[PDB]
C-alpha cells in the first residue's frame, strides 16, 4: 500500500512556491529528506546533486518555461523533464501541477504529482 | 546509517486519492494517511471502490445523503467524463457520520498514448459553518 507517485505541496501565497510538504515516495525516489527541502523551491531537482549551482544543460529549458507560464497563469501543467537524485543520478519526471483556489479567487497552493521514470544514463 | 523517510507526515496538509481511469468507474488504487485519519476510513476498506461512498452518512447508508448538492456532484461527473480539472466544495461524512466539508480538486494524468491513465484527487477538508448536530 504505497503511492504510485511523488506528491509535493507548495504555498502559493509566499513568494516562489516554497515547499510545505513532500510525501515518502518523493523522499525515497529522489533521496532528499523532507527536512532538507521544506521552505524552498523544487527547482533544486534540476541541478545535478546538492552542490551544482546551475540548471543542468540536459533539462529542457522549453519545458521549464512552460511551468513558469502555467504557474503564472494559475492553470494546470503536465510535462516531462530531467531531474536528479541527491547522489546525482538522473531521473525522468512525468510532472503534473494543479493549483488550489481559495475562497477569494486567489490560489492558496499548488500540488505537484511526479510520476518518476528511469533511464539508460551517462556520466 | 539512514535518515527515516516520512518524518513530517503529520504535517501533510490534504488528502490525496489516486484512481485508475482505465478500469470502470474510477476504482481507488491509493489514498494517503490524512484521508484515512480525517475520514476515519482505512485504505483496506476503500481500495477497489469508488470515492462516492463519502457522500453517504457513514458506512451503513447505502445512498448519498439528501443534503449533498447534486449540482456539484454533476459538475464532477462532467469533468471526469470530459477529461478536465475540477474544483468545488462538497459535503462528505466521516465513518462516524459527522459532517466534513471537502474542498476537492481533481486533475487527470495523461499517459504515453495521450490517454488518461489516472485521476488524482486532492482534499482540503476545510473550516465550515455547516453543523447538523444535536
Ligand atoms: C507544487 C510544485 C511542484 C513542483 N515539482 C517539481 C518537480 O518535482 N521537479 C522539477 O524539476 N520542478 C518542479 N517544480 C518546478 C519548479 O518549482 C519551478 O517552478 C520551475 O523550474 C520554473 O521556475 P524557474 O524557471 O524559476 O526555475 C514544481 C513546482 C511546483 C509549484
Ligand atoms: C480521483 C478522484 C477522487 C475523488 N474524491 C472524492 C472525494 O474525496 N469525495 C467525494 O465525495 N467524491 C470524490 N470523487 C467523486 C466520486 O468518485 C464520483 O465521481 C462522483 O460522486 C460523481 O459520480 P456519481 O454521481 O456517479 O457518484 C472522486 C473522484 C475521483 C476520480
Numbering used by the authors:
A (entry chain A): 13 to 135
B (entry chain B): 4 to 137
What did the original publication write about this model?
A plant called Arabidopsis thaliana has a light-sensitive protein called ZEITLUPE (or ZTL for short) that helps it keep its circadian clock in sync with the cycle of night and day. In Arabidopsis thaliana, three LOV domain containing proteins ZTL, FLAVIN-BINDING, KELCH REPEAT, F-BOX 1 (FKF1), and LOV KELCH PROTEIN 2 (LKP2) act in circadian timing and seasonal flowering. Recent research indicates that their divergent roles in the circadian clock and photoperiodic flowering may enable interrogation of how chemistry regulates PAS/LOV protein function to select for signaling pathways. These proteins retain analogous elements, where an N-terminal LOV domain regulates activity of a C-terminal E3 ubiquitin ligase to target clock proteins for degradation in a time dependent manner. LOV domains are typified by blue-light induced formation of a C4a adduct between a conserved Cys residue and a bound flavin (FAD, FMN or riboflavin) cofactor.
